[PDB]
Amino acid sequence: KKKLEGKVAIVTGGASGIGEATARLFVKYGARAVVIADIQSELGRSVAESIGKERCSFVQCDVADEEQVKSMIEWTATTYGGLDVMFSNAGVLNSAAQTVKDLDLPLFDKVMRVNTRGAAVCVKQAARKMVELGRGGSIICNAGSSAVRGAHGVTDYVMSKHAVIGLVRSASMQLGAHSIRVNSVSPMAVATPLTRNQGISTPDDVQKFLMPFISLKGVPPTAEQVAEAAAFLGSDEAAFVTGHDLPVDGGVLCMPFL
């Protein structure tokens, strides 16, 4: 029996990177369907077609827009007959250094909108639908190693990921009465279009810039490792796990220097 057999999932930010890998893995693990919610429509549609349109749909959705998220969740539940897992994974990272001394406030606003407002909207709207359906559920936010430690730059992003932890803890306490679990996964070293904003483009960039700060050697980091943690948390394998951040980061000593 596959661990997500028959389950309906949403993956926000599923057009690329960790979200795409997670959508793919959820289908491999028996999901009835995965809805990819993203702003990249051509790319999202192509990912859905690649996974297979009988088990994956793309919906255009800005996670920070509550009406768009509500509409996307309603469509998901009506189309596929439920909503068992929400993976609130969409995020952004600025290319500017974002040290606190030279913090660009408009760029801070952009990061906080997607990474904190989007998380709050997705957790709220998933929770409402899960409470309505009465079948419990599993809500997962994609935080990051910077959710529990400071960094030498990317200060807005660090603040946003700490805020996600606060959301997860609070939501877990508030929604547990309805058998809804809320957790986060925290990656670090997966090269994606997002990490390219801070110069991490290739597996070699990961080795040169990130791995000196990571304990676990001989295990190259991948998007699929993060997807595995999300699938564990989304499944009944984690039936009694809530309020928790699960890092998939090789043991981060401290965040890399600038």
Place this chain on the structure above:
Amino acid sequence: KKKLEGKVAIVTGGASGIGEATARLFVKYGARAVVIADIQSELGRSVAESIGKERCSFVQCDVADEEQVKSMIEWTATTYGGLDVMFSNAGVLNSAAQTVKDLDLPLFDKVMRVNTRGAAVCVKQAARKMVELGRGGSIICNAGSSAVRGAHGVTDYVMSKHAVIGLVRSASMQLGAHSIRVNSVSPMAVATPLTRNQGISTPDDVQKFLMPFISLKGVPPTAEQVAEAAAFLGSDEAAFVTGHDLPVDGGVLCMPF
């Protein structure tokens, strides 16, 4: 020698509550000038007058407005010839329950703006001035017990205070090269106009609703206790303390239901 002798401080949100108590205590501990930065102008002027105009000045300032904060810091440093302590203390708490299932998003936006954008602005702008002056400095944010734990409501506020911790940690790492310390204080049980938004108006409300969740008994909680922690962190008593959250909360078991 008094622990803040000769120091110049800014207290944002200093017109009321913990900020007012902290401005008062900083002067008692020898601060040469304390600037109260607040949006309550009438009240802030009256508080500065009560503390004494020779030691305390009021500047109208929305902490989330970077130009206003920059102007207020420039005025402080030009008028008094320094800036040793920034206490970024302003905050807001909505009267709505703010459960995540029924979260009011515009009210979330307000809380995040004051409590996270205001913190970021004040830390940035204080840091710039402290780096320019070359004398080190101490920056303190007012977080709260909800900065390190979840709550059963006030979800926006919890998120905002967690974000403050991330700011403090990051800023401490980035500004330590210039001998600038960054820390937070985390209160819980002081009845103020802010806490009135969630039904905590009197010391008796604190006893009935909050104290069951607090370990330390027989010590009534006060604004002055929080001010003492801020004065410790602002002073050379804490010369090698940075990146830290200092809770003044009697040992919180969990947030109230």
Place this chain on the structure above:
Amino acid sequence: MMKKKLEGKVAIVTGGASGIGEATARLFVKYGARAVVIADIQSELGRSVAESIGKERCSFVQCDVADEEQVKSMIEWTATTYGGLDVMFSNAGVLNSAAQTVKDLDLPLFDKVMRVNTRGAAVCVKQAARKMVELGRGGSIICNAGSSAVRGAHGVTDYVMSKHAVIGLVRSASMQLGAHSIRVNSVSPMAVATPLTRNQGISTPDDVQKFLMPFISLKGVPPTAEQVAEAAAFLGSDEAAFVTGHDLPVDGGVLCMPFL
């Protein structure tokens, strides 16, 4: 059939004669483990559990986890008999029946708890690490901590100290052994009624509901030993290939530890 997420792995479960350890040994075999060695001081019970799992895939070895020579011998036997050592679940523990408040702390009873729960952990992590480094195939070491590993309690002070010490061991070992592709993590239960929890009045699932569940957020999901076993199997497997230095709580979201 389940996913054979532990296909071919050789595991040791200390404290595997009972409770969470027994459930974990059983689940590891269900998930395709080559073998599980149950290392325990309860010989009659341990032998019976091994026979119940199946002697072709499970062996019992008499072993006091705080005795370094016994642990070393048990690991050597495991590796020689089954050709490897891929997972160590350092799960043995003890809990006193005495309240163990700090004001009335019984020091000899503190010593007993610290011996099994901290010395035993250190011995098992050391000796598993040595064998894993020797074999050159990486590995996964898991300690059974508890919800009290990351928070204070109103009694059981020795036990709380012991579980905090386990977290320090896990963090340190993860940092030191990562160079050899060895992962070190903990699982932290709370609400499984076992002979150990009976020492503090938690004997039945109803005791769990009455005394523990008021302090736990997640409702409608009765707590079981098997839930903890699932977390250990996740951490022991390649599903957690890049997870190290971490405590994974299986506790329904603990608000705070229950009052005395």
Place this chain on the structure above:
Amino acid sequence: KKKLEGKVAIVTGGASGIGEATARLFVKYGARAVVIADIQSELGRSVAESIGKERCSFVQCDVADEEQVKSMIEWTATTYGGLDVMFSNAGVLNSAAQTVKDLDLPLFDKVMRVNTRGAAVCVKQAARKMVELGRGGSIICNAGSSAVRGAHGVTDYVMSKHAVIGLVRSASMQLGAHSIRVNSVSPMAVATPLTRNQGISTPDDVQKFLMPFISLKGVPPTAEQVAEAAAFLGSDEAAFVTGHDLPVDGGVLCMPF
């Protein structure tokens, strides 16, 4: 009024290093008396004489021996009329690397005995006397930066300091009903005879081997900084602070390799 005016303190491990500095500072801050409880008798007597025999006494005491600790506390209370602050500061660090792969178990036992058994004994016995006297009190353990993070060696020591945090958290919850506070201080970079066991003897050693891992620059680390944090926690400045670890470590990025 000085912050420890009239208070009676015990500093375990007060014959050397941070404990000595803390005993000295407590007297400077007005303590009625400080009892140095240590196993190094000649050294402890020399420290007490230097601080001043009218305000400081030495008592021979192995912190892991419950009868000796009880006797020392009884002597303190009989001699000086109370017990307001217990600083459970004694600790040891092996010279061996103590990696987990090559952990020496008898040396692990030594570290765990002083650093965990001694902490438990001192917190228990101070708590008993404080409950008896009915005046509240402040109990402080000396933990360390390794109390909240892993290290690349000294594994026994890391375990011991994590256990201290568990003790402090638990004791704070259990003793708050009697207005007794329990906290820790966590140093990192004070060169002492203890740190000499891992090659840290001089200010230059600190700069070369420890400071790369510490955010705060331009502020040389000292024993007196740790003493200041202990004095804050021991005093009414921290009247509503309990269950907390207060790091005096310049912001530790991670433990040194």
